[PDB]
Write a protein that binds this ligand. Structure first.
Ligand SMILES: NCCCC[C@H](N)C(=O)NS(=O)(=O)OC[C@H]1O[C@@H](n2cnc3c(N)ncnc32)[C@H](O)[C@@H]1O
Ligand SMILES: NCCCC[C@H](N)C(=O)NS(=O)(=O)OC[C@H]1O[C@@H](n2cnc3c(N)ncnc32)[C@H](O)[C@@H]1O
Ligand SMILES: [Cl-]
Ligand code: NA
Lengths: 501, 497
């Protein structure tokens, strides 16, 4: 592009002519938002020639109306301000007027000094005496994201999206706001926020394939964590009673509209809670947060982008419960075989998948087949926030056996519009069973289940020191933002999402 | 261990007799802190047989004073309560008195139900009618805190040693204060990728991993710097991030392979602004935690000697090259990255018995000299300033000093806490300095970073004048909590073997 080349040449001409080249420090008098706050309500034509002020931002517009007069718009911290540069007011010690302004291009980061007020037409303005080129833009910028080459430019060059698209900036402010609300909710309950390792000698705490790496000096392989669950429960053994953690998990899996290989999760562990308590807390936290952002519990959503239809999500509590096995059997019209992990039920579930054209998982463990059946018959019923509850033990190796239902656990997942938001349970705190389920996990992994975890002996030893009855819970922060901010693509709520190619 | 095997045998006998086996839910009437608050003032010997309460904690002591009377201490949420179990009050529907209590051991997590009050001797007590085993402990616990056990079994350290719990509460309080400092300034907290196609932003060897679906090698981030600056190009003006970095390097008293760093980027700041902010932020936090700017520190552990660290402002500044030349009694050769000065710095390291770096780049030699001559003088919080450009590939050239940059490091007791600078925002130079890093890496420098074209393209869209800054949260907690081992401030630190 000839434009980038010429700009470099211009900057070389500036630097070798002794003129301002990338000044180190520009001292603004106030922000542009502060400027609009102080001066936005003056009368049209008002100017305070007794006050000199320095302002800075990115040039979004240049218009020379005459040989004597140049109009700029600059933008900074969500505020636009017009600069009126009149040759009569020009500080000639900064160079001749026409030379000073010939160095400026739309998109440049620049400073101005001048008198505050309002043009006779009512535009909030600075009547400038000087202009300083702080940081030039070397590329021709479009006017909006609509002028970009493709819309993947928004994700690969996020600075362009943030520069040109106010809706993108709003998303990441909302994301911060929601996380603040969430922290405050648990801080007020007396929780302690902790950090537990993202480098693990043994990965665990979820059904997910890990990233593998290696520590040279300790001569050992490590896994990026797929979940903090196993460390956090050890803190409850240690007596901290209420802990939470907000941070990244790493899952070496495919990317789609609701999966990024790193994502932000919150987990908390509350001694003496069970999953009934956790269901009530989930409803209270999420509906409070929805109310905080939206002013009611019925919020809009565009499932096919904003050129599509607009639906309503109703967060009114209490939310519907679906029982895992019962809702599958209602969809099938017959019962699963018992025990659920028998070879007989495994064969039956295979024949049910092929009957209902459900893509088989690999390998064909009972847990993975149950999950496929659930995704087909149950998760698709979850339009408004719904709990899917009481998952079979065989697919929940860390959830405590259900106090009433054989073969099930005290577990729930929260689903919104068929997408999973939360995973939670009464915690398994019995070491014999826990060891047994770890062995079954290790067996599945050895059979090719890349989402099954190895046995963690350190964790079994911790349970032998006595984990109090405890309730635990995990939430996908990014997926929460998708719903709060009305995005159907997770790449909209992560600043630098993973991209192919 | 016979004790562990025997406890498994007890729990099977319990399960097979239909007796309580890991109850799913125990509803406490109130917490032990709440119980202490409500009844801790009643007269001695007082008892309210009209009020029945349920309490739970971990058993810390069992005294079976007679066949009819058993005293327990339970502990939960930092509060101890005594349980007085008299056979005449026992709910025999839960088992005969002797059978119910034969199932409990020290260290078990248990619940009790009974009447509130105070023993005649004046101890806050529950006069219990029942006991329920909630989660047994299968191991004999010591009265008190190898001491490497504290780090490999952190739950035992927390269970038994209040000081360990105090540290991690202090850590939380400190991070809260820091978030609040920047939130009130209008900063926006952000999250940038920990998996990187290209590592950069620091001098460190990365961890290497691999994403199978995309068939691409990846690095874990050594720092978020390059992404965060892209956010200032995007116009967010004031951002910060608090999270893990990953560095594939040796562990010692101040290094863990993952650690918690805070970085922030402030449009229109330079490094003099950032020095003033560092002073205000840190001294205010020290004063908040300690009630003065002079605090104790034990460099050789708690039984060793105790010194005083003084955070009174303004803090000392040391100029990087000038202080080295003071220590040498002679001047470095110019330019500092010429082969002549590289050879001269090698001579100076041999003369002063400073171990040589590999490879022997100007930058790493300069670092070794500074480590010997300048970092050692930083007892109280001190800024080392104006690093040569050759060791500062992302820092903007000094407005006055040739070959130097507008950079500082904060040191405390000879340990690095902060690294900050006026950000380089001129793309031509930045490309040149990335090319020199790539050359160093190709010559064997495993801490030099490859060229990141996506960052250079970002700078061509115009990065405002900006000041940026990183802090090692863990190392800060070390001084605030008076620990000389980074393993004391990280819940699950990395361990050898
Ligand atoms: N002891 C109770 C269980 C706690 C949570 C458990 N350790 C766990 O990790 N569950 S999870 O369901 O695998 O992850 C929690 C949430 O993370 C979200 N998640 C999972 N994978 C991804 C990906 N790849 N991107 C984004 N969000 C994701 C989703 O909302 C899940 O409900
Ligand atoms: N643009 C301004 C520069 C910002 C910081 C820069 N990106 C950076 O990473 N500097 S750093 O010095 O490499 O890391 C910041 C701090 O992290 C701390 N640190 C570094 N390595 C470790 C390790 N290994 N463990 C613990 N703490 C560590 C130490 O306090 C450093 O001052
Ligand atoms: Cl002393
Ligand atoms: Na309700």
């Amino acid at each position: 592009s000839h434009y980038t080349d010429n700009r470099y040449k211009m900057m070389e001409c500036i630097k070798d002519a002794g003129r301002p080249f990338y000044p180190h420090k520009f001292k603004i008098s106030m922000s542009l938002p502060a400027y609009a706050l102080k001066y936005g309500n003056v009368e049209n034509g008002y100017i305070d020639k007794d006050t000199t002020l320095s302002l800075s931002g990115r040039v979004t517009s240049i218009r020379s109306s005459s040989s004597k007069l140049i109009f700029y718009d600059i933008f900074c911290e969500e505020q636009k301000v017009q600069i009126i540069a009149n040759i009569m007011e020009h500080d000639i010690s900064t160079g001749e007027f026409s030379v000073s302004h010939s160095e400026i291009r739309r998109g440049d980061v620049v400073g101005f000094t001048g008198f505050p007020g309002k043009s006779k037409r009512g535009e909030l303005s600075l009547f400038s005496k000087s202009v300083v080129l702080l940081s030039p833009c070397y590329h021709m910028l479009p006017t909006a994201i609509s002028g970009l080459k493709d819309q993947e430019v928004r994700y690969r060059q996020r600075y362009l999206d943030l520069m040109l698209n106010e809706e993108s900036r709003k998303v990441f402010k909302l994301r911060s706001r929601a996380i603040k609300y969430i922290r405050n909710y648990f801080d007020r309950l007396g929780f302690l926020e902790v950090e537990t390792p993202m480098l693990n000698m043994i990965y665990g705490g979820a059904a997910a394939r890990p990233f593998i790496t290696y520590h040279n000096e300790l001569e050992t392989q490590l896994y990026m964590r797929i979940a903090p669950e196993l460390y956090l429960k050890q803190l409850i053994v240690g007596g901290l009673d209420k802990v939470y953690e907000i941070g990244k998990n790493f899952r070496n899996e495919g990317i789609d509209l609701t999966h990024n290989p790193e994502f932000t999760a919150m987990e908390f562990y509350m001694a003496y809670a069970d999953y009934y308590d956790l269901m009530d807390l989930t409803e209270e936290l999420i509906s409070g947060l929805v109310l905080e952002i939206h002013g009611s519990l019925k919020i809009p959503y565009h499932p096919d982008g904003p050129e599509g239809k607009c639906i309503e999500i109703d967060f009114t509590t209490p939310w519907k419960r679906f029982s895992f096995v019962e809702e599958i059997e209602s969809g099938l019209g017959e019962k699963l075989k018992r025990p659920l992990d028998s070879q007989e039920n495994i064969d039956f579930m295979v024949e049910m998948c092929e009957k209902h054209e459900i893509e088989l998982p690999h390998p064909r463990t009972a847990a993975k087949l149950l999950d496929k059946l659930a995704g087909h018959f149950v998760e698709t019923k979850c339009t408004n926030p719904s709990f899917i509850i009481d998952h079979p033990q065989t697919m929940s190796p860390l959830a405590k056996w259900h106090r009433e239902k054989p073969e099930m656990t005290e577990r729930f997942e929260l689903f919104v519009l068929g997408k999973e938001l939360c995973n939670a349970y009464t915690e398994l705190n019995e070491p014999l069973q826990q060891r047994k389920f770890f062995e079954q996990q290790a067996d599945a992994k050895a059979s090719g289940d890349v989402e099954a975890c190895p046995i963690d002996e350190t964790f079994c030893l911790a349970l032998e020191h006595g984990l109090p009855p405890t309730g635990g819970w995990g939430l996908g922060i990014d997926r929460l933002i998708m719903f709060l901010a009305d995005k159907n693509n997770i790449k909209e709520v992560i600043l630098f999402p993973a991209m192919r190619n």
